[PDB]
Homo-oligomer: 301 residues x 5
């Protein structure tokens, strides 16, 4: 079966149509070729035969002087935007300005929503992790943080490509003149308006990129602080363990002393209890003094 | 209710007025449109119909040949600057130069104050943390450091956008000529003076950026030194624990020897005390020698 | 023996020939010199005497207006591409466009295959390592990750050089005109078509580079999370060891007490069992209380 | 009291004068204004009314066709350079070349001295720290390293601003022509000589920057090696502690066995010594075998 | 004594001479001044009075239309290159091309040799370190790695300066025309040949730089893997130590129980052996059960 395109068409007045059409018929209707309607690039804005071709991550659009076409809209939850919002926007400037503004605004709003969803989750996770009241931290939250960081990196890449394309178009004026397809087809400055639009969207994308970068550096700083806190807790607990081990060693030493003096043999000292009491007292007090002196020695270090 | 703008107006002589006006009335009074007085960008300097439009993080200003307007000044502690300092500054060069200089100086002073407040806190916190006399470090100070680093990153971003805008205006001369709205409205070089102003403020911002970068790298180096100190303390305490464990092991070994020789049974050796004394002496001295030899073995490693 | 080149030649119609020829004979047949057919650069696209010379990591090609030549194809598993696919591609545009498109498509497909092979292995390895259910991680998987990261870095370098060469050619128009060797030899716009080709391949390479960068940053984040998890497990186990050591210390203390009270001597207390039972009970309960109080003290920290 | 400038003046012949003068009198004597002699930038080279104004970190200079002036030289140990070296340098090229060369050479020599002082200290400290013969490292040396790294970062920033200013002047030719104040005031190529001077100093600064960067990367590598060494020592000592703990556990186990068999009760086995000797021998040998088997088990891991 | 230069001179035919000459005599023989033959820059290529002046790290060369001069060749093991290889290379293009090609080829070969020597040592050291079969790693190999990394950084810097100089010359055409000193002195395109030479050497240097960068990133990844392996071994050994400590604690607990029940007093239970056997059996089995239950509790965590 020959491949087909599921297209939805918007007119100047805002009227909407939807259908499916063969690629060859689409090429014949327009002045394009299969080389153009291939959509091999993640982000692209191009002009061919007075027709504008735009592609986002998943949005494919063709703009003509008298109509707009969205291709492959099925299974992408675009119905609300297509059948409820776009007609209002499209209903003195030409059609190209309105269409380009609508598409760019949609993409920018999508990116803003992504960032606004990502920010609070990361902030809450970092606030929970940095809490110095716990010697350990949860790991499910760490996995969540990793996934959200991956999503943030993808968002940063998308913003970067958006800005790159917009700036590449802005620098040259030939492309700016090309975007005015209506005047070329059927011959106030259009160039100024297009420059204003592109500059506005470029600045918005730059703001988003700065916010994402700030979030990433915050993540890194939080990771470093987490490392420091864990190391400090380790050192505290090891100090306590050493302090207890000193006492254990002293106790074992004097227990060996007592055991050796208390063998089941003859020592010529079983007829006196004063010696026994003296040994008990001296062993206990010496345990105490040795423990204290070892504590002081550790403190000296 | 229709939206309104809370505006304060400064004249050439420095006279001050304040009121609220509908956005449509503002647009009609000037030659602008709602597309311009939207304020969608964090930092922006633009020119439209011989009117300069400036926006900072929270400062919104419109400059005309004969007046200046500050918009949305309520609840921003700007009263001291507006009603005490600005009139003196505004009271032979045209009005645009004075207004632009005042606004840029205000923003630069704000950034300088932020940096001057941030620096000593971070320096004191790092000095306290780096102290090698403690095996552990406080965590409230770590949280303070994290918050101040976040603020520092935000300040760096603000300085970056400021410099970017200033340099973008400086490179082109068409924008420099545009800023001379008074001459265009009613036709010594203005371009040289504007270039001097913008270059001065750009250089000040560059100095601030360099200072912030130095502070950040200092923070990173301090973190690394903290890690090293904690690891060294860990190793010292573990060495001490191992040294004590050697003695504990030797003591336990010879205690087992004594216990085994001192069961409540018959060993055919309970009639002699010389053997008992010999066993006590040899067990103690051998404990000592084994402890010393294990210490030497550890030292060999 | 004089050096030779193992060449395979493709004609306009797609006919294929293969043989070996002396370098001097090759130079004489073309208008080149040994200075050109030296192949000292990993990636290179050049034009000499209306002949295009291209080199990839291991692919060496010479393009003329009427023929294409691939050099040193032996022992490189290029037979499938040479004798099965290329003739179909080469069978209204001139020959240079088809040849360049074929070579660039081959290289791009090779890079895409490399990346598609690398991605799932790294993802699976990282997913296995990040599993927080294990206090330790395997090391063979770490070695695999290291090798795959090295391969990824090599791939990134290759993509970078590809993009650099393509962009260097695109910026200038003299080189674009040079690539149209057929028109120069024997005098619709060729420049536009060549620009489209190069821009398409540059954009594809940029997408690949972005994907590789995302993978690398993911690797780094996974490493950090692994460090954090290991430290947390360390702290947990050390806390448990300390808790057990407290009880061991208390038990040893009261065992020393009992041993001291139970020497094989006279203590004037062997005629009463109530004292013995009291000592047993008090030593046990005090062991419990001291253990609990030390646990509470640790909890206070 | 009106502010004043402490100035020292050098003539063409090298004659020296020194005094203090009011800022207004200085402005009147020259053709400048207070806007110029403000010195708000850390590093600056500018030209105003055929007068060159230069500022370094602490050096302030004004160059005219017939004289040189150094401002605010008190309490900066500049007496040796001012009254011993500069007159010799200033005594066929015009005065501006000599003055600029002198100032730039002074600054470059200062930076070189800073770097030459910093290098050996850091190298010695790193050599001492990296010594793998110590399980721990000193902390005073770490503080010294931190301070020297801060100084190195400041030096890098200074070199960067120096290079930026020199290159900004070099790129344009209008500024190069401006620097030839003598010819403009009273109308072999001066531009070539100035370009040579600036290029020479730019190259020297670039060399210094490269050296500083190499030092910094060396510091980072040394830090990583220190971390690795500390971790290895930790692991070694923990392995030894585990080996000793195995023996302690076996000894305690068989000591419990002996104690249980040696209660102060009736066991119907006190009439035979062969059983006692057998128990002693078997407990000792089994202690040995269990210790060895646990050692082998650890080795298996 | 006046300073002198130890020079070796090559003619067009390849004839070689060597001697020492005063700097003033050298300046007089050529059309240069002491300002030129100062050699203050690590890497430099310049043209003065139809004479080319080149300096590498330690190679100093002056090229004229009719001769080449190498200065300060003593104690630099350059005899083999000077008296065995260079004459063959120098024996239709002018002399400047041959001389420049020879010098650049020498430098490139030197850099290639450095890199080829450095690579295998680092690879072997990293392969030895990454071996996961050892809980610890050697430190002499770490010192070797540090030294080789320092050398690699120096090599990268040298390659960078080489590329910077070559590209700076390539971008401008005035310098390219300047390098053709022979035509200027005594008036096929020379510019094309010089561009080809410089581009070839620039590309070779770029390849070397990419290789060095790959090596450095490999080093960093290996360091991270080493850290991970050490941490995993630490955790394993700590888990084993905890498992042994559980058993030690249980054994000590029940040993205290036995000791308390076995005091040298009256307990009204010395007339029955069944109680003694029951206590022994229950203490042993309970030791086992408590050890197993603590093991399960640890496993739960
Ligand atoms: Mg993506
Ligand atoms: Mg902000
Ligand atoms: Mg490679
Ligand atoms: Mg400074
Ligand atoms: Mg060097
Ligand atoms: Mg660590
Ligand atoms: Mg007894």
């Amino acid at each position: 079966v020959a491949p087909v395109f599921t297209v939805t068409k918007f007119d100047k007045q805002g009227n909407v149509t939807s259908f499916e059409r063969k690629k060859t018929e689409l090429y014949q209707e327009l002045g394009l070729q299969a080389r153009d309607l291939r959509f091999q690039h993640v982000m692209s804005i191009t002009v061919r035969n007075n027709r504008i071709i735009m592609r986002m991550e998943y949005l494919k659009a063709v703009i003509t002087p008298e109509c707009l076409l969205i291709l492959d809209y099925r299974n992408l939850n675009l119905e609300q935007w297509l059948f409820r919002e776009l007609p209002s926007q499209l209903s003195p400037l030409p059609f190209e300005f309105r269409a380009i503004e609508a598409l760019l605004q949609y993409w920018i709003n999508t990116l803003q929503g992504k960032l606004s969803i990502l920010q609070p989750l990361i902030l809450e996770t970092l606030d929970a992790l940095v809490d110095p009241k716990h010697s350990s931290v949860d790991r499910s939250k760490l996995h969540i943080l990793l996934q959200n960081g991956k999503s943030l990196s993808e968002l940063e890449t998308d913003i970067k490509i958006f800005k790159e394309s917009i700036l590449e178009i802005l620098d040259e004026e030939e492309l700016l003149e090309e975007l005015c397809v209506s005047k070329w087809s059927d011959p106030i400055d259009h160039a100024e308006e297009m420059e204003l639009l592109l500059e506005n969207y470029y600045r918005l994308a730059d703001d988003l990129s700065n916010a994402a970068r700030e979030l990433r550096v915050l993540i890194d700083d939080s990771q470093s602080i987490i490392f420091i806190n864990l190391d400090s807790h380790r050192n505290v607990m090891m100090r306590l363990n050493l302090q207890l081990t000193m006492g254990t060693f002293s106790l074992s030493l004097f227990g060996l002393m007592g055991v050796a003096f208390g063998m089941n043999l003859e020592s010529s000292l079983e007829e006196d209890h004063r010696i026994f009491w003296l040994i008990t007292g001296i062993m206990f007090m010496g345990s105490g003094l040795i423990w204290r002196r070892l504590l002081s020695f550790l403190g000296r270090q």
